[PDB]
Amino acid sequence: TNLTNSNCVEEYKENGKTKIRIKPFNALIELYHHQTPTGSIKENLDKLENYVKDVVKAKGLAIPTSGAFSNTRGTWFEVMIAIQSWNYRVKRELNDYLIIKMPNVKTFDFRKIFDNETREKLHQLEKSLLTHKQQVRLITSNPDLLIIRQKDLIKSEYNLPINKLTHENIDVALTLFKDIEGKCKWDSLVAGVGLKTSLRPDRRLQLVHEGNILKSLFAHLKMAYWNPKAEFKYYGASSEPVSKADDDALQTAATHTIVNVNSTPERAVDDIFSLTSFEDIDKMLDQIIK
Amino acid sequence: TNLTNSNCVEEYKENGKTKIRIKPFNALIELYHHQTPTGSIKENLDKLENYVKDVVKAKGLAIPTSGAFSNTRGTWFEVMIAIQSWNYRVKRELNDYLIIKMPNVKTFDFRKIFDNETREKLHQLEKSLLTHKQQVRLITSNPDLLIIRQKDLIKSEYNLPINKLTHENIDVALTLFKDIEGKCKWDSLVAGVGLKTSLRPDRRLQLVHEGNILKSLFAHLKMAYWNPKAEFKYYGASSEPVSKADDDALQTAATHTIVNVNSTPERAVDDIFSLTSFEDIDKMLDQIIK
DNA sequence: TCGCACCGGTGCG
DNA sequence: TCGCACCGGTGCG
Ligand SMILES: [Ca+2]
Ligand SMILES: [Ca+2]
Ligand SMILES: [Cl-]
Ligand SMILES: [Cl-]
Numbered sequence: 383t384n385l386t387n388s389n390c391v392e393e394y395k396e397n398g399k400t401k402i403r404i405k406p407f408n409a410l411i412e413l414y415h416h417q418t419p420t421g422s423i424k425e426n427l428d429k430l431e432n433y434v435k436d437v438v439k440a441k442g443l444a445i446p447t448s449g450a451f452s453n454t455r456g457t458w459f460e461v462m463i464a465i466q467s468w469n470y471r472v473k474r475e476l477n478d479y480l481i482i483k484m485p486n487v488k489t490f491d492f493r494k495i496f497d498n499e500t501r502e503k504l505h506q507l508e509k510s511l512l513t514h515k516q517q518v519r520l521i522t523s524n525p526d527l528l529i530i531r532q533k534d535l536i537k538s539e540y541n542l543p544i545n546k547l548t549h550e551n552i553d554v555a556l557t558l559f560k561d562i563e564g565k566c567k568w569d570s571l572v573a574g575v576g577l578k579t580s581l582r583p584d585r586r587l588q589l590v591h592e593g594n595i596l597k598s599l600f601a602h603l604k605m606a607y608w609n610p611k612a613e614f615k616y617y618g619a620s621s622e623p624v625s626k627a628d629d630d631a632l633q634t635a636a637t638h639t640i641v642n643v644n645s646t647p648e649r650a651v652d653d654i655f656s657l658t659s660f661e662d663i664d665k666m667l668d669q670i671i672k
Numbered sequence: 673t674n675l676t677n678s679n680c681v682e683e684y685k686e687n688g689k690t691k692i693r694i695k696p697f698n699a700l701i702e703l704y705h706h707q708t709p710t711g712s713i714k715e716n717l718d719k720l721e722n723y724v725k726d727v728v729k730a731k732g733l734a735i736p737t738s739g740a741f742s743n744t745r746g747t748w749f750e751v752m753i754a755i756q757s758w759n760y761r762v763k764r765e766l767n768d769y770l771i772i773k774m775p776n777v778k779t780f781d782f783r784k785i786f787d788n789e790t791r792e793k794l795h796q797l798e799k800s801l802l803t804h805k806q807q808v809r810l811i812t813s814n815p816d817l818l819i820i821r822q823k824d825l826i827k828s829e830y831n832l833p834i835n836k837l838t839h840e841n842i843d844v845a846l847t848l849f850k851d852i853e854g855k856c857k858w859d860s861l862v863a864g865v866g867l868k869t870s871l872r873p874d875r876r877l878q879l880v881h882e883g884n885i886l887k888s889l890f891a892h893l894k895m896a897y898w899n900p901k902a903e904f905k906y907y908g909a910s911s912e913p914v915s916k917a918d919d920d921a922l923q924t925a926a927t928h929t930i931v932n933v934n935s936t937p938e939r940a941v942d943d944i945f946s947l948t949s950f951e952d953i954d955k956m957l958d959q960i961i962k
Numbered sequence: 963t964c965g966c967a968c969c970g971g972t973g974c975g
Numbered sequence: 976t977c978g979c980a981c982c983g984g985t986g987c988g
Contacts, residue, residue, distance in 0.1 A: 453985045742972070747981075
């Protein structure tokens with residue numbers, strides 16, 4: 383019952399008023415410092431939410447808003463996937479694959495992953511797209527997970543599994559991206575994944591935009607290197623059931639692949655996964671990689 | 673002070689519990705039955721929100737959630753733009769232009785606007801995109817406003833201005849789409865507009881997806897009819913200031929226009945408007961149409 | 963200071 | 976019954 387000394391919430395000052403802030407990572411640690419989560423993802427998210435809700439209540443404080451939990455639930459789901467993806471490549475012994483949880487585009491633009499030769503190809507494109515009366519760009523939010531196949535990137539440190547959630551464990555999973563800055567050959571990036579706790583008819587179109595933009599960058603790289611064999615695939619994943627409507631929407635073409643009558647149409651999002659249990663995270667990775 | 677007899681909120685039964693529901697149209701009528709809104713849009717939205725908030729408070733009831741107001745504010749902004757667009761074409765005497773507020777994709781798929789010859793061209797595309805091992809589609813939410821140039825579509829009934837907000841006035845603005853079912857030639861549709869009370873780094877990419885998909889449908893129509901002169905433009909509009917970041921994101925290419933080194937890159941969203949006052953709605957329409 | 967990216971809770975047909 | 980499309984309120988660097 384010692385909820386009163388929890389640190390999953392945090393008081394702070396704003397306009398002479400004490401304000402409340404959820405600490406999402408702290409909530410993870412306090413519930414999982416002995417054992418990372420198992421069973422139903424959706425149920426674990428609610429357990430985390432009802433924990434903080436009990437911490438505030440016993441502390442005498444105001445309930446955080448629905449917006450605060452949306453932000454927080456998004457992080458819980460991402461950290462859960464990241465950690466389970468870290469452990470997947472260990473127990474499967476995939477010594478040439480990395481599954482990386484990416485930060486936001488300002489912290490680390492995903493194009494920074496690539497080597498010099500490829501970063502300049504992309505810069506040739508970027509620069510040429512601005513050299514017109516009407517300036518154009520190619521912008522999107524960072525993919526949530528990147529799957530990279532490149533042997534020389536794996537170090538022995540990565541083969542140690544994460545059995546418990548600590549500030550230090552979460553930090554290595556969430557800074558792994560740093561190790562690969564500059565080192566990737568263009569055709570080593572093999573897939574990306576967009577993660578959402580839930581979908582909505584509007585928010586689900588964000589996955590399509592993302593895949594469309596990434597594949598467009600990649601189609602350009604296929605051309606510059608004149609390599610028709612290399613592929614980049616993009617995927618969505620939800621913590622809820624995926625309806626038929628969600629399915630139809632996520633069948634939307636990568637529009638540059640439908641210009642001519644003889645082109646093979648390509649989907650922007652190759653597939654959408656409904657992650658009910660942690661087991662399903664393993665199942666999804668099986669399809670993506672193999 | 674007679675807030676107690678307002679109908680902008682409405683009690684209803686759910687699991688033996690009386691629940692509260694905002695009636696957004698009713699709020700509009702009760703505040704604007706003598707005079708449609710003028711001045712600052714953003715301020716009028718807050719006036720509508722503080723009206724309902726005062727109605728519930730004086731009635732003794734629970735405050736509607738932040739989600740309820742998001743849904744409601746979205747409608748207020750749309751009805752305001754629609755009505756002001758109705759009056760724009762009247763006072764400007766544009767006898768060959770319609771600016772139509774569109775409903776959702778299930779109520780009225782926007783492709784229903786087109787004549788038979790064009791609806792079959794689109795069906796040839798739709799059918800061909802499914803005739804592959806990997807089924808693909810072209811899906812998006814309905815554009816908020818359509819701008820259509822076709823003389824034979826204007827009737828004298830449309831030239832009467834809307835000076836006050838009544839259930840009957842709002843209804844004609846919101847059912848105008850019905851009049852044009854089947855009657856549009858492909859190159860009569862000249863622009864679309866996506867309307868948002870506010871932007872966010874994720875929600876703003878929805879405008880890009882939309883414009884990308886619409887222009888892709890249109891590029892196909894340009895090809896089938898072999899007409900290089902016809903254009904379709906797509907625009908965004910916010911009720912808040914538009915930052916530089918919002919601007920950069922909305923400079924994103926329509927990806928099918930950047931495949932070859934000699935193609936002229938096209939933006940998915942041709943421009944983004946910050947609508948501070950009702951006057952700005954008139955200004956935007958001036959740029960779009962002329 | 964603000965930009966990024968998160969997602970639930972609606973009103974309505 | 977649910978699918979559509981709406982958008983604010985965050986935690987954090
Ligand atoms: Ca995501
Ligand atoms: Ca809109
Ligand atoms: Cl195991
Ligand atoms: Cl006037």
